[PDB]
């Protein structure tokens, strides 16, 4: 019914069997082996893992860059094994409420279509068994509520094979799928794994395609077979020859733009080539600002973290590394002030471009060069979380001892805590278990608890660390102290905290 010359080249030349899939052979073999031994694992209750390690996972998580052939490979492996494909995609609502009334029934139930289609067939034991394919898991948005958790629970209480397909795996939303599926990673096909297919397509479509320029096309499409096929289809409409005379124009016109990751952004921005006289004409200031804007919530942190681990090559005659570092730090402080002004009540987001220069571009322009080591992710977030937790515990302690002390939390930390340590930790190290009564009396006088004790002893830094001292305390003393604390009533300062 459908004419053979009226279909997209991607569908017309789609692989018919797994043997025609180009690239990522190892992943294909692994997936085929996993799908060919699922029954044995089920009979073993997914307990006896095999040599390949695929005998314990009842679900598969396929991931890779777009346009590599994950969906096609999954569909072909499902078809060749005789299973019945049930596909759930991003165009179907996959919220928790809808999923609870949907695929749950099919996860542990035979297919009627398979029974009524393979009834006359023989040895097709897999024709009546469902295989679930969840395509574009990353495509779930606020429109799908609680889908990730439902899928994570599905991957462990599933009675039928399940295959998940996604484009981004490092995203935090994939955290629940960390250790519940067999991870299959697909790479960008090489220029030699698709040469024969592309030459065959060119011969069939009656347009000349010079082999010597093939690689650049992939370099232009960056591992996207679908994109290069579409490029060929579009160019062949009016241009019947693809040679070195016009390869540059099409490569420039069809260049794919993908936002760089924070690590890649930091690596590129801290390179001295782009800041040279010749590099600046290629990678301009606008290009650097766009690179910053690719991820404006992480770039300044990465720059501030990784600007001390470079070997600058753009140092001014007579300038030292330390002077450039100081200038970069001053610019970073100015950018921090600008950022604080940006996120104020006025919401001056129009200053974001300025923050690009004062936080990322300018400080990097003074220490640009070659990294002296591996790029490290910013550690400021963990430090901020730890400081917030410490401040919360300090506030709790201060308001627990407010009725007895005349000071603030800052004064409590800076002045009171050492004196308190002199009474709540020191006498355990001298009198052994005979200091329990005095410590309990102090706690009662200042309305302190055991959790408050742990929080207070955890604040100290420098040569007054208490972790080793606390650990070296005999276990009998600690047990006796706990028993004494739990064997009597204590006053409470704040009620219904």
């Amino acid at each position: 019914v459908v004419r053979e010359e009226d279909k997209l080249w991607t569908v017309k030349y789609a692989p018919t069997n797994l043997q025609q899939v180009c690239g990522n052979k190892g992943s294909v073999m692994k997936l085929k082996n996993w799908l060919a031994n699922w029954e044995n694992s089920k009979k073993n209750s997914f307990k006896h893992a095999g040599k390949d390690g695929s005998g314990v996972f009842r679900a598969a998580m396929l991931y890779g860059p777009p346009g590599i052939g994950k969906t096609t490979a999954a569909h072909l492996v499902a078809q060749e094994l005789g299973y019945d494909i049930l596909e759930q995609n991003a165009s179907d609502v996959r919220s928790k409420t809808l999923l609870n009334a949907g695929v749950k029934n099919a996860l542990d139930n035979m297919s009627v279509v398979g029974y009524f289609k393979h009834n006359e067939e023989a040895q097709n034991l897999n024709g009546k068994h469902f295989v679930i394919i969840m395509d574009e898991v990353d495509g779930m948005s606020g429109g799908d509520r609680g889908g990730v958790g439902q899928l994570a629970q599905f991957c462990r209480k599933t009675s039928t094979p399940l295959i998940l397909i996604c484009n981004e795996r490092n995203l935090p939303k994939m955290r629940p799928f960390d250790r519940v599926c067999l991870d299959i990673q697909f790479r960008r096909p090489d220029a030699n794994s698709i040469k024969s297919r592309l030459m065959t397509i060119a011969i069939r479509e009656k347009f000349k395609l010079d082999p010597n320029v093939i690689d650049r096309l992939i370099q232009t499409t960056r591992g996207d077979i679908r994109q290069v096929i579409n490029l060929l289809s579009t160019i062949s409409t009016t241009t019947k020859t693809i040679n070195h005379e016009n390869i540059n124009e099409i490569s420039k016109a069809w260049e794919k733009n993908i936002a760089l990751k924070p690590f890649d952004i930091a690596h590129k921005m801290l390179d001295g080539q782009i800041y040279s006289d010749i590099g600046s004409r290629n990678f301009t200031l606008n290009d650097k600002i766009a690179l910053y804007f690719d991820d404006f919530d992480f770039t300044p942190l990465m720059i501030q973290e990784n600007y001390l681990s470079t070997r600058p090559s753009v140092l001014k005659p007579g300038q030292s590394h330390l002077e450039a570092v100081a200038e970069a730090a001053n610019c970073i402080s100015l950018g921090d002030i600008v950022e604080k002004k940006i996120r104020s009540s006025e919401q001056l987001w129009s200053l974001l471009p300025l923050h690009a220069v004062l936080s990322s571009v300018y400080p990097a322009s003074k220490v640009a060069g070659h990294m002296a080591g591996r790029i490290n992710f910013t550690a400021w977030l963990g430090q901020n979380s730890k400081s917030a937790k410490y401040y919360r515990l300090l506030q709790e302690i201060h308001y627990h001892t407010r009725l007895g002390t005349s000071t603030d939390k800052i004064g409590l930390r800076l002045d009171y805590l050492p004196t308190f340590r002199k009474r709540l930790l020191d006498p355990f190290l001298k009198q052994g278990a005979d200091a329990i009564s005095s410590v309990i009396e102090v706690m009662d006088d200042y309305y302190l608890t055991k959790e408050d004790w742990d929080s207070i002893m955890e604040f100290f830094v420098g040569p007054d660390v208490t972790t080793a001292i606390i650990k070296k305390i005999p276990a009998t003393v600690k047990s006796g102290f706990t028993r004494k604390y739990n064997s009597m009533t204590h006053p409470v300062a704040i009620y219904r905290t």
Partner: protein
């Protein structure tokens, strides 16, 4: 006095692909696809007012003939394009059974797709993939980076270039001949110079002139159309002496009604895109302009601040 006349932008909006000027290779490719059918999924990107919406509309009209009404689904930023809309209405249109000539397909035109949310774009993927034998997708956007990578992978790329002076000039002669407008060479040159490659602005200026003064000349065009202020800002920033820059700012910017915030923003952009100046000097000037912008945003939008910024920039470039 209440019978409005159709503006020349809509009156002379091209209806065939042969009336579109500029981007010759893409226009001939579109014409060939329309003649031979089999229109693939496409994404057309470019700056405003270059003929993307017109191009897609002409392509769809020529392809579908009389079936345009029942075979074209057009959605833009002025219509609801939420995730539910994509999941229900677009799916219904794609699954619709419409008898068409053998070489034609249903067309969905999502204009201004750069404003669509990520969820709708993600949901559209399998909708285009599964129903590619009956329905095809043509997106028109201003910024290509706002479209998710999978959609670009499934679609061809058509990046429209900037309209050359010759093409705009030729279209102007054609429209003037059609309207029988008395013109002079200098007036047309001024109109094209002020248009900066925007055909719509050129048509608007050409209508406003003649509609207000009759004959087209440099003076008539310039008394209603002002020279782009970015050029004046660049001239001020490149002045050899501080006195010249101050005079330019006072005469062409401050006394003409331009606001300080606009002036500082334009200076920021111009310094961002100044190739002749060294990158380090550009960064210092950007820092100074940002300081001035922060001062202005706090309330002190005075000519004194702009003069101080110009003086500091001159000191830096000395």
């Amino acid at each position: 006095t209440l019978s409005l006349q159709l503006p020349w932008v809509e009156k002379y909006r091209p209806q065939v692909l042969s009336d579109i000027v500029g981007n010759k290779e893409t226009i001939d490719r579109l014409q060939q696809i329309a003649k031979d059918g089999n229109m693939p999924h496409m994404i057309i990107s470019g700056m405003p007012g270059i003929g993307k919406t017109t191009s897609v509309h002409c392509l769809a009209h020529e392809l579908l003939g009389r079936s345009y009404a029942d075979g074209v689904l057009e959605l833009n930023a002025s219509d609801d394009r939420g995730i539910d809309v994509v999941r229900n209405q677009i799916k219904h249109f794609a699954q619709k059974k419409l008898h068409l000539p053998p070489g034609k397909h249903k067309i969905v035109i999502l204009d201004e797709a750069d404003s669509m949310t990520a969820g709708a774009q993600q949901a559209l993927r399998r909708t285009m993939e599964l129903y590619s034998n009956s329905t095809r997708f043509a997106f028109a956007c201003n910024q290509s980076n706002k479209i998710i990578e999978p959609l670009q992978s499934r679609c061809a790329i058509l990046r429209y270039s900037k309209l050359s002076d010759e093409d705009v000039l030729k279209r102007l002669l054609q429209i003037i001949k059609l309207e029988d407008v008395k013109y002079t060479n200098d007036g047309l040159e001024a109109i094209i110079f002020t248009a900066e490659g925007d055909m719509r602005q050129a048509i608007n200026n050409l209508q406003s002139t003649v509609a207000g003064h009759g004959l087209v000349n440099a003076d008539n065009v310039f008394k209603i159309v002002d020279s782009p202020h970015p050029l004046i800002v660049k001239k001020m920033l490149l002045a050899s002496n501080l006195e010249d820059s101050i005079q330019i700012l006072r005469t062409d910017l401050w006394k003409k009604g331009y606001s300080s915030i606009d002036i500082v923003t334009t200076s920021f952009r111009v310094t961002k895109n100044l190739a002749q100046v060294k990158e380090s000097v550009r960064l210092e000037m950007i820092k100074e302009i940002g300081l001035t912008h922060m001062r202005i945003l706090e309330g002190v939008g005075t000519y004194l601040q702009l003069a101080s910024m110009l003086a500091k920039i001159h000191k830096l470039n000395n």
